[PDB]
Each structure stands twice: as C-alpha cells, then as structure tokens.
Amino acid sequence: MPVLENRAAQGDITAPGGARRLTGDQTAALRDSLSDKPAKNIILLIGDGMGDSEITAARNYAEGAGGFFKGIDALPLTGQYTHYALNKKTGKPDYVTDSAASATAWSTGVKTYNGALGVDIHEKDHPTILEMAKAAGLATGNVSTAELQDATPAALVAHVTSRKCYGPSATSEKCPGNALEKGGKGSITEQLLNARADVTLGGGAKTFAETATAGEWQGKTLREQAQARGYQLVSDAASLNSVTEANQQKPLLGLFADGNMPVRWLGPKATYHGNIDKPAVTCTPNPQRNDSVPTLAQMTDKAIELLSKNEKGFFLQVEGASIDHQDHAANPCGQIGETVDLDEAVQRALEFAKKEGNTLVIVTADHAHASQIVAPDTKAPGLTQALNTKDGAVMVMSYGNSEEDSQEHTGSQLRIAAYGPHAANVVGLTDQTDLFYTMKAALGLK
Amino acid sequence: MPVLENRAAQGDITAPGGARRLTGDQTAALRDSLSDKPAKNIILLIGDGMGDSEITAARNYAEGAGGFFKGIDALPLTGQYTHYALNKKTGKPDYVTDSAASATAWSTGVKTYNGALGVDIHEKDHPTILEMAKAAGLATGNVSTAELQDATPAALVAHVTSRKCYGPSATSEKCPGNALEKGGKGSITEQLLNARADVTLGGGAKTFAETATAGEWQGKTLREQAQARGYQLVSDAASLNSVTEANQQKPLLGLFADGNMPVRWLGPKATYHGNIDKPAVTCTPNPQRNDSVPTLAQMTDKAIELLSKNEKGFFLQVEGASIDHQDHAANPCGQIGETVDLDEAVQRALEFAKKEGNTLVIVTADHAHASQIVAPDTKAPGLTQALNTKDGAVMVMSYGNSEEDSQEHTGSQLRIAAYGPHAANVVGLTDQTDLFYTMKAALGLK
Numbered sequence: 001m002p003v004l005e006n007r008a009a010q011g012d013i014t015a016p017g018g019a020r021r022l023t024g025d026q027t028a029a030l031r032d033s034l035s036d037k038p039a040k041n042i043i044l045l046i047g048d049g050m051g052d053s054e055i056t057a058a059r060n061y062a063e064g065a066g067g068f069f070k071g072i073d074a075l076p077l078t079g080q081y082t083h084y085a086l087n088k089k090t091g092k093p094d095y096v097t098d099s100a101a102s103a104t105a106w107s108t109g110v111k112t113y114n115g116a117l118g119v120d121i122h123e124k125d126h127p128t129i130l131e132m133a134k135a136a137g138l139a140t141g142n143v144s145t146a147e148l149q150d151a152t153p154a155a156l157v158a159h160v161t162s163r164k165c166y167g168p169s170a171t172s173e174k175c176p177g178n179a180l181e182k183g184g185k186g187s188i189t190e191q192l193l194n195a196r197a198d199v200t201l202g203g204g205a206k207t208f209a210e211t212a213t214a215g216e217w218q219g220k221t222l223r224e225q226a227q228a229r230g231y232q233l234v235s236d237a238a239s240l241n242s243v244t245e246a247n248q249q250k251p252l253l254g255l256f257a258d259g260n261m262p263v264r265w266l267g268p269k270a271t272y273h274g275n276i277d278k279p280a281v282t283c284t285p286n287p288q289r290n291d292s293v294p295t296l297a298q299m300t301d302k303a304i305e306l307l308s309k310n311e312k313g314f315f316l317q318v319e320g321a322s323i324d325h326q327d328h329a330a331n332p333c334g335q336i337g338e339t340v341d342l343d344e345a346v347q348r349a350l351e352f353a354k355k356e357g358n359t360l361v362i363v364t365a366d367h368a369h370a371s372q373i374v375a376p377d378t379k380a381p382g383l384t385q386a387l388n389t390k391d392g393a394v395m396v397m398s399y400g401n402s403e404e405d406s407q408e409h410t411g412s413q414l415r416i417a418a419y420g421p422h423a424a425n426v427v428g429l430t431d432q433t434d435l436f437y438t439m440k441a442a443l444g445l446k
Numbered sequence: 447m448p449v450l451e452n453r454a455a456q457g458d459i460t461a462p463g464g465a466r467r468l469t470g471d472q473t474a475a476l477r478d479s480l481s482d483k484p485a486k487n488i489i490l491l492i493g494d495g496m497g498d499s500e501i502t503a504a505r506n507y508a509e510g511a512g513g514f515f516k517g518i519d520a521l522p523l524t525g526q527y528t529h530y531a532l533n534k535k536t537g538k539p540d541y542v543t544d545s546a547a548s549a550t551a552w553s554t555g556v557k558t559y560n561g562a563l564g565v566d567i568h569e570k571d572h573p574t575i576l577e578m579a580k581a582a583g584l585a586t587g588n589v590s591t592a593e594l595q596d597a598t599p600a601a602l603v604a605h606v607t608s609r610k611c612y613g614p615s616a617t618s619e620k621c622p623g624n625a626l627e628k629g630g631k632g633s634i635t636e637q638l639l640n641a642r643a644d645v646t647l648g649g650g651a652k653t654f655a656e657t658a659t660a661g662e663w664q665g666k667t668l669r670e671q672a673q674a675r676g677y678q679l680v681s682d683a684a685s686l687n688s689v690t691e692a693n694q695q696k697p698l699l700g701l702f703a704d705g706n707m708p709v710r711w712l713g714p715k716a717t718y719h720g721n722i723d724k725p726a727v728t729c730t731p732n733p734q735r736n737d738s739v740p741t742l743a744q745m746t747d748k749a750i751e752l753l754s755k756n757e758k759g760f761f762l763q764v765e766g767a768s769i770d771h772q773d774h775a776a777n778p779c780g781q782i783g784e785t786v787d788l789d790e791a792v793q794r795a796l797e798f799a800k801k802e803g804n805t806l807v808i809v810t811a812d813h814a815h816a817s818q819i820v821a822p823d824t825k826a827p828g829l830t831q832a833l834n835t836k837d838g839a840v841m842v843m844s845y846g847n848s849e850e851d852s853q854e855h856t857g858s859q860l861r862i863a864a865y866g867p868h869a870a871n872v873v874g875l876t877d878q879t880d881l882f883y884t885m886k887a888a889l890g891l892k
C-alpha cells in the first residue's frame with residue numbers, strides 16, 4: 001500500500017507540463033491502496049479548523065504553491081465530508097458546528113447540539129470510540145496540544161451537557177446534573193480520570209488543581225487523585241522520554257502546560273487594510289516553544305511506541321489544536337505554524353503505518369474556518385495581512401466573518417484523507433458520523 | 447462502474463446512525479470504479495467559482511444538510527486540486543487566479559498570468575485540448591451559460607494576450623498583436639469562428655454584430671461571416687431542438703442571449719447585517735428564464751446527442767457560468783440556483799456515461815469564491831443574508847472579502863470528482879494543469 005511519495009510540481013512551473021503533480025497514470029497505485037482486511041490499529045489526526053483553505057495557505061507559505069506536505073498531502077484516498085450539528089430545541093440541522101458537537105459526532109456516531117460532549121439532543125450518554133476500543137482490550141491514546149479539557153480530546157472520555165464543565169467548580173454551576181455532589185458522573189476532568197486511557201498527553205494542568213467536592217477522593221486535588229489512582233504523571237519532554245511502559249495498571253498522564261501548549265510561530269495579528277498599509281510579514285519561531293516542551297510529533301512518536309507494545313492493537317487520536325485558536329485570533333503565522341506542526345505528526349504516523357501494515361491513518365478537521373486567501377490588492381472590510389511566502393512572493397490572507405473579537409467557524413464541507421485497511425470509506429461524500437462507523441468496523445469492535 | 451446512487455443521510459438525523467451517508471464498506475465498489483482502459487469520450491463540467499463552500503451552501507438550501515445532489519455528489523473518485531496562477535513579470539506564483547488563467551491551465555497544461563487566454567507568460571500560444579481532439583478526428587463541443595467570449599469557453603478556441611479582446615474593436619486596442627488588421631490571429635470571436643467546433647452553444651450574440659476590419663470577410667458582421675462559413679445559426683430552444691446533425695461541414699452555433707443567458711432563481715442581494723436586520727429569504731424562480739431558452743441540462747443533452755454520432759468519439763466542455771457572477775454579486779439565490787442548474791446537466795452527463803461505458807466525466811471548478819456559511823447570529827463586517835432552507839431551518843451566508851462592488855475569488859484548493867476510464871487521476875492532491883494531461887492521455891491524443 002503506497003503512500004504518495006511526492007506530489008510537488010514536477011518542474012519549471014512556467015513551462016508546459018512543469019506544474020504537473022502527477023508523472024503518470026494512477027489507476028494501478030489506487031488499486032494497490034484498496035484493502036478491506038481488518039485494521040489492527042487506528043491513528044486519527046485532527047487539524048482543529050483545518051479546512052481546505054487552511055491547508056492551502058499553509059502549503060503556499062511553507063512549501064510554496066507547487067510544494068507538497070510530506071504528511072498532510074501524502075494520504076492517497078481522499079474525499080469530503082459534512083459536519084453540520086443539530087438545534088437542541090428543534091432537532092433541525094444547525095449548519096455551523098462548534099468543536100464539541102463535531103467531536104461527539106465522529107466519536108459516538110450521533111449528531112448533537114453545539115456545546116454538548118458525548119451526549120445527544122436528549123442529553124443521553126453514548127459510548128465513545130475510545131471507551132469501546134478499551135472495552136475490547138485495545139490500548140488507547142488521546143494526545144493534543146490544547147488543554148485536555150477542551151472539546152476535541154474531552155469528547156473521547158467525558159459526557160457532559162456543556163463543554164464548559166471543566167472541573168468541579170464549573171460543573172456544579174454549568175452542569176448541575178453531571179456534578180459529583182449532585183450524584184452525576186462528574187466534570188470533564190473527573191471523567192477523564194475515570195476513563196483511564198493508557199496514554200493521555202497535552203496541556204490543561206490548571207484544572208487538575210481543583211478538589212473533588214464529593215466521592216472517594218473528596219477534598220483532594222484532581223492531581224492528588226491521579227497519583228493516588230496510579231497514573232504516571234509527567235510534565236516535560238525529558239520525563240516523558242523516560243517513560244518505558246504505559247498500561248491500565250500504569251496509565252500515563254502528561255500535563256505539559258497550564259493551558260494550551262505554546263504555539264510554534266509568532267507573527268502580528270491581521271488588521272483592517274493590513275495588506276495595504278503594513279509591509280509583508282515573515283513568520284518567526286516562538287522562542288518560548290522550548291526543548292523542554294515536547295512537540296506534537298514527539299508526543300505522537302512516544303504515544304505510538306508505548307501503545308504498540310499491546311499485542312491486541314490500539315486507537316490513538318492526535319490533535320493539532322491551536323490551528324483553530326490562531327484562526328479565531330486572525331493570526332496567520334500562528335495558524336500556519338500549527339498546520340506545519342500538525343504535518344510533522346502526520347509524517348510520524350505514516351512512517352509507522354507504512355511499516356506496520358495494518359494501520360488506518362486518517363487526517364481531517366472537525367469543521368471549516370474563517371480564513372481565505374485573497375488577491376494582493378484586495379481592499380476588504382475585515383482583517384488582512386500580507387505574508388512573504390516560500391516562493392518569494394506575497395500572499396494575502398483575510399478574516400472577514402465577524403465584527404466580534406473572534407473570527408468564526410464556517411459551514412463548508414472539507415477534506416478527509418486516509419491510508420491503510422478500510423480507507424476507501426472516506427472517498428466521495430460522507431458525513432462525520434460516518435467516521436465513527438468506519439473506525440468501529442475497521443477495528444471490528446462489536 | 448458504479449455511480450453513487452444515494453449518499454443521503456440514511457434516517458432520522460437525531461438518532462444514532464441516522465445521519466450516516468454510507469450503508470456499508472466501499473472497498474469493493476471503489477475497486478469496480480478503477481479502469482485504465484481508454485476513454486472514448488470526455489465530458490468536463492465546470493462550475494465557475496464552485497468551491498466546496500458553494501457546493502455545501504447549495505446542498506443545504508435545496509436538499510437539506512443530509513441531502514444528496516444526484517449529479518454533483520454522485521461521482522465516486524474525488525480529490526482536491528491547486529489552481530494558482532503566475533505573475534507575468536516575475537514568474538512567481540500568484541495565489542489567487544482569475545477565470546482566464548485557470549481555464550488556460552486545464553486546456554493547455556501550462557500555467558499563465560491572470561487575463562491570458564491560451565498563451566503563456568511569454569505570450570506564446572499553446573494548443574488547447576479542443577484543438578487537439580479536433581486534429582485527432584474527434585467531435586468537439588463547447589457549451590456555456592455565459593457569453594461565448596467569456597474566459598471559460600473562450601480558452602478552448604482563442605489565444606489572446608487579454609481576455610477583454612472579445613471582438614474587433616476591443617482587440618485593436620487591447621490586443622494590438624492579435625488584431626487582424628495588425629496581422630495577428632484575430633479577436634476571441636473571430637478565433638472561435640476559425641476554431642470551428644462541431645457544437646458551440648451559449649450567449650454572447652452582441653459581439654457577433656461587429657464587422658471584421660480585415661481579412662476575407664472584411665466589413666461583414668461576424669454573424670454574416672458565420673453563416674457564410676457554413677455554420678448552422680440557432681437562437682432558441684425550438685430551433686435548437688430541430689437540429690439533427692452537427693459536423694465540420696455543418697457546424698452548429700447557438701447564441702441564446704445577447705450577453706449571459708438568464709439566471710434560474712431570483713433573490714435580493716446580501717446586505718450589511720442582513721441576517722439580523724432583514725427577515726429570512728426564500729428564493730423565487732426567475733419568471734424570465736423562459737421555455738424558449740434552453741436550460742443547461744437541455745443544451746447538454748442536445749450536445750451529447752449530436753456529438754455521439756461521431757464513431758471516433760468526442761470532447762465536450764459544459765459550463766455553469768453564472769454561479770461565479772452571482773457570487774461576485776453577493777446574491778445567494780442566484781448563486782445557489784446556478785449550482786442546482788449545474789447539477790441537472792451533471793445528471794444528464796452521468797446517465798449517458800453510465801450506459802455508454804467509455805466516458806470520462808469530470809466535475810470541478812476553476813477557482814474558489816467568496817461565500818462562507820456562518821452562524822445565524824453572526825455580526826459580520828460585510829454582506830450577509832439568512833435563507834430558509836429545505837430543512838425548514840435558517841442558514842446564513844456571508845460575503846466579506848471586498849469593500850468594492852464585486853466579491854473576490856479565493857485561493858483555496860477545491861474538489862474535483864470524476865467517473866469512468868482514468869478517473870483515478872483526480873484522487874488525492876493534483877494541480878489544474880494535470881487535468882489537461884489526464885484528459886489528453888485518457889483520449890490517447892498524441
């Protein structure tokens with residue numbers, strides 16, 4: 001099963017045939033990529049808000065228009081999928097989803113309302129792909145650059161009526177029925193601690209400083225509860241590197257930041273008439289990203305090393321979280337850097353898959369976002385910025401869908417790409433809930 | 447070779463599994479869709495400005511979020527392709543392309559500057575896929591809802607340094623070197639006349655009222671030159687229907703409007719804070735579309751009947767032109783109606799292909815556009831409108847990338863789907879110039 005080794009423009013883009021990405025007919029290669037044999041493992045990579053527009057701008061900047069992302073662009077079976085949510089009250093489609101409703105969609109197979117995690121419009125809990133893979137005996141991993149209580153990773157292990165029910169204090173007032181003192185399953189963090197995935201890595205240390213208001217570990221911080229429950233706590237790249245085993249008896253929990261892990265590149269925020277008024281921007285590496293802070297490609301490599309020891313197989317969800325945050329912030333360099341960062345993790349995932357032979361790799365996003373690539377001389381109503389690209393040319397990016405402080409998500413259908421046994425199930429048009437079923441069946445969970 | 451018969455949400459979208467579009471594993475279906483046998487014919491369908499956002503908005507409105515377009519969404523091999531142009535002066539990538547440079551890309555296989563038609567950055571002509579198909583003996587058709595001098599169809603038969611060189615008067619001043627009086631190949635219209643495709647249908651009658659300034663048919667209108675050269679002039683549905691043969695000896699030319707043919711649906715234009723201030727819009731059929739004016743689906747069906755008489759095979763380009771115009775106009779209803787209109791033609795195309803068996807069908811767009819699907823309560827800086835969808839819910843559309851009168855194109859990569867011999871070549875990441883080589887080889891033109 002081939003991986004697209006190189007789809008970069010093959011020559012001089014100004015000459016006939018120079019911009020071509022193919023060098024020959026693909027039928028045979030595509031035939032060699034179809035396989036319905038079972039999947040022993042599944043690695044799902046999610047770019048938060050990484051729609052086709054985000055992928056194209058990132059590619060233009062970092063690799064040039066005719067460039068190729070060795071990770072993101074290498075998956076050979078591609079398609080487009082819909083990710084609309086539901087109105088809680090009416091049950092009708094809500095065309096633009098938040099991150100919680102979409103995450104719940106691919107993780108349980110049921111559409112839901114914006115802000116909901118692991119429940120339906122009736123607020124009924126539904127098993128997640130993670131809980132099921134675990135029940136079946138497979139190893140499970142949940143890695144992300146966001147705080148672990150954010151929607152994308154929270155959706156694999158918590159079922160709360162509202163995404164804001166981070167820890168005890170927010171839950172008591174936002175999710176009274178999920179609150180431990182009120183007899184419910186608990187806040188997002190407490191639920192994460194009960195779900196016990198073998199590997200969980202990300203930020204969000206802050207909430208672990210809260211104290212249970214009821215239950216066995218009442219009055220102890222959730223950090224104390226974790227240690228007390230047998231979790232291997234780790235907080236830097238070195239200690240993370242030390243880890244040699246991770247399992248149900250010795251579950252690993254890496255908290256690498258109080259909130260979201262640091263962003264990879266720095267740049268100014270887009271502004272009104274920024275491409276006209278201000279000069280072009282060249283992104284700069286964030287000197288605070290640190291070598292004591294593991295990178296997403298590092299977190300992924302470790303998770304795969306550890307989870308692969310399980311003879312039974314594994315399920316791993318990896319997330320490039322800050323792409324969505326930076327898009328909301330109208331900051332091109334931060335947005336693009338997190339896309340580059342995500343590509344590195346995709347490469348470490350394909351390398352394993354390629355060798356292993358029974359791994360389904362999937363790369364996609366939860367919903368589309370605000371940014372659009374527009375002409376250099378555009379005079380737009382919103383925020384824009386000109387960037388000096390790898391090609392030595394100027395690219396102008398525009399965020400114009402909100403007057404509020406945050407740019408908004410958008411409803412367009414977007415790319416889904418896969419590699420391995422059962423990747424055929426992402427080709428053509430599909431729905432995000434379909435991804436739950438594809439994964440459920442590829443793994444043969446019943 | 448299967449066509450996706452139904453990818454609509456399978457049931458109650460509020461229940462588990464109800465929003466699924468798949469009913470089973472697709473590996474076997476995808477295997478039956480791969481063929482490298484030669485293509486006898488090729489039907490290329492272009493949605494001008496039809497990016498994934500345009501397709502999604504149109505589906506939500508006309509079919510509902512869980513709907514399915516029987517034409518547009520039924521192609522089983524899909525992918526994404528890049529369509530960046532080149533800076534004439536520098537040779538560097540220009541991230542946002544106009545319709546001239548993109549059209550030249552798939553029709554000649556060479557990247558070029560915005561505004562160019564059938565020439566490279568050096569202003570050198572290059573043969574078009576149509577000129578080649580013709581030289582090879584295949585029948586050729588060029589259909590569109592735009593004026594025939596517009597970029598998308600102009601590109602198959604003209605080579606001018608600027609797309610504005612419609613007829614004699616414009617050429618003399620905009621393209622002195624292409625000017626007939628100055629010894630060049632002639633204006634877009636004159637060149638169309640010389641190209642002599644078997645079937646050419648669309649609008650743009652206005653320019654044929656000009657008179658050559660030189661050459662054999664000097665001082666005659668281009669209309670007179672057409673009749674004099676043996677073209678079958680037709681201008682309404684009925685006369686179009688009467689046509690029983692179309693060939694090199696009796697080439698057919700249908701001019702159904704002075705400019706662009708009429709748009710299918712009417713609605714007001716988006717406005718500032720339109721979704722907040724104004725009530726929701728329900729699109730209304732244009733009572734001037736007329737039954738004497740053949741629809742795109744009809745123009746397509748006729749073109750297929752006539753061109754299929756050629757034992758050798760044929761090449762046909764079909765274009766839903768007004769999607770792009772309505773998007774520039776910030777008119778949701780117009781933009782959506784031409785996408786539905788395009789779907790009708792795609793169905794006519796798949797039906798023929800499905801029975802015939804040696805036909806490569808490709809549906810894609812030249813570039814992405816401005817429109818985005820945003821939350822109902824969005825407070826945006828540009829133009830917005832709320833529409834009442836088929837789901838009985840409200841969808842808000844937003845155009846926010848220009849302060850000028852026209853909304854601008856965008857650079858995002860977009861969908862490309864195919865069906866038939868050689869469709870594998872559109873899967874994964876490709877470039878618009880690759881579509882020229884795919885068609886060239888599928889037809890075996892050398």
Ligand SMILES: [Zn+2]
Pocket residue numbers: 048049098099100324366367
């Ligand atoms: Zn999100």
Ligand SMILES: [Zn+2]
Pocket residue numbers: 048099146150151152153319321324
């Ligand atoms: Zn997220």
Ligand SMILES: [Zn+2]
Pocket residue numbers: 049099324325328409
């Ligand atoms: Zn977001």
Ligand SMILES: [Zn+2]
Pocket residue numbers: 494495544545770812813
């Ligand atoms: Zn166009």
Ligand SMILES: [Zn+2]
Pocket residue numbers: 494545592596597598599765767770
């Ligand atoms: Zn056009």
Ligand SMILES: [Zn+2]
Pocket residue numbers: 495545770771774855
């Ligand atoms: Zn346009």
